[PDB]
Amino acid sequence: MLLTRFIKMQLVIFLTLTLVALVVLALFYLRLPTWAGLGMYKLNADLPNSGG
Amino acid sequence: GQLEKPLATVGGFFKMSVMTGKALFTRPFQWKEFVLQSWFLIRVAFLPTLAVSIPLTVLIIFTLNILLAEFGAADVSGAGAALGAVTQLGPLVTVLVVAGAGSTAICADLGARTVREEIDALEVLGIDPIERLVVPRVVASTFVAFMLNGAVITIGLVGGFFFGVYIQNVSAGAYVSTLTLLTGFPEVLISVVKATLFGMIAGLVGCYRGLTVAGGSKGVGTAVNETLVLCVVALFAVNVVLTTIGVRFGTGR
Amino acid sequence: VLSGRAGLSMDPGSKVTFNGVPIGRLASIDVVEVDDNPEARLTLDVDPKYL
């Protein structure tokens, strides 16, 4: 049923656009690895006062 | 050849607009049709205009107030409250509630006239549709857009004042005394120009798409959808251009 | 919190801090007559984790 291969072409080009947009937004604009903590280690500090 | 296809419709629209201007400046004006179309657009795009303008200006004022309160400068909020509302919120709400309501209504009405052969009935009687129909509709679109832009700016400023004072506990005197800090005659003038151009372009696009409807069983709906999309795109582009021109003059500089 | 004067640029929503970190916010400010002298009274809403 269906599978006219033009709807398929629209679907695949839309999926390519989806993946490109999602990866670019996640990496170069939102910095998801930085927000989650990928490639980073935790370090603590004790202060007499916050200093803002 | 690929560009030549939309260029034909572009040329049809431009020639129709030129003929509309010629009929406006040469042939006698249709006061009755202008009044009828003005009242029609007012009744079709007034309540949605307020219902979109009030929550949007409340949202903008809330965001500005919280960001400035964290910034520390919560007394200059009214400045921003004016600066957006006069130059962007007014004309953009005008764009939305004119293209969505009035332009689509004009396109649907003229498409209904076309599919019922009323345009051909006028044309075989020797009458010219461009003078009897398009000119009053474009003038009414411009007039209603002007008035609606004024009302949107006023309602937005008042609602922002009330929300900020009675909800976010900002000082009222700081709101009313900082409104003119960044907004003056250039801002209201460019807002008026934006509203007039938006209304004129929306009326022209609606009339042109209504006159060239394809009939069938989905032709009128397709024409209305294309009218709406074209109006949104064109009005956003014109808003960008006019915003650049307006900030070139500036109250602050 | 009672004080001689509230201080300028002190309005409801001002941060209350402990050791420099916010722990709450200022709710309201009022003028209270203590021994025939007006003083400022501040009401603070504080998260009970830090109490």
Add this chain to the structure above:
Amino acid sequence: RFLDSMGHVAWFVVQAIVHVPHAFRHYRRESLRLVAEIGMGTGAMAVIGGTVAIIGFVTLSAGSLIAIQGFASLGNIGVEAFTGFFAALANIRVVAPVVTGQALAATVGAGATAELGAMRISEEVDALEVMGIKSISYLVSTRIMAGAIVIIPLYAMAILLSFMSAQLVTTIFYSQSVGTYEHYFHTFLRVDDVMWSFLEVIIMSVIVMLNHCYFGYFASGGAVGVGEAVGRSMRTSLIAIVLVVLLASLALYGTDPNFNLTV
């Protein structure tokens, strides 16, 4: 009357929601076709890119407006290095969700209203009901599933293009250094705001699709009534989008503004 109309629309939305699993199981090829049609447009608007191109143009325009006016005002005051900080909070909080919602409303919702009105007038809904098919499940639930699948890529592209337009206008036309813009952008932008904005856009898209499917499904009056249905649906969609964004922003940041500059 008024209560009766509210009950009719409530019944329509309930029936459309409860048939989503039925549509998902029974109709997969139809859902894929509708996903392709919504993503890449239909008719004469599909040749230019469809919904993607319209969304991109409108979001680029909105980002350009933000950057333009923002940089002008801050340069007049003097504190113009905050533009990257000002643009991001302008896009995420207010501008990008509402603008993407209106463009999505226009394109996808008007197309859905026109399609369902044409089906209603052409007696295709009657043909489906005669052949023992739940018309609401086949049409409206499939539209809702396609919209839910397609909204996240669309809003991701919208956010990406708005950010790109603001940055390009600020750092090319206004010749601001890219380092300062990127610092003030990535320092004062929280991914939590973007996640909540995505949730707002998903809810708004579901509501918009429901409203437009309601207006197109119960169309009447031949080909003439379809355009009037499109106009009414557009007005309702504008109101609903603005209301949804306002309520979500009021709920999220009512107590914690989620932004720190001073001590």
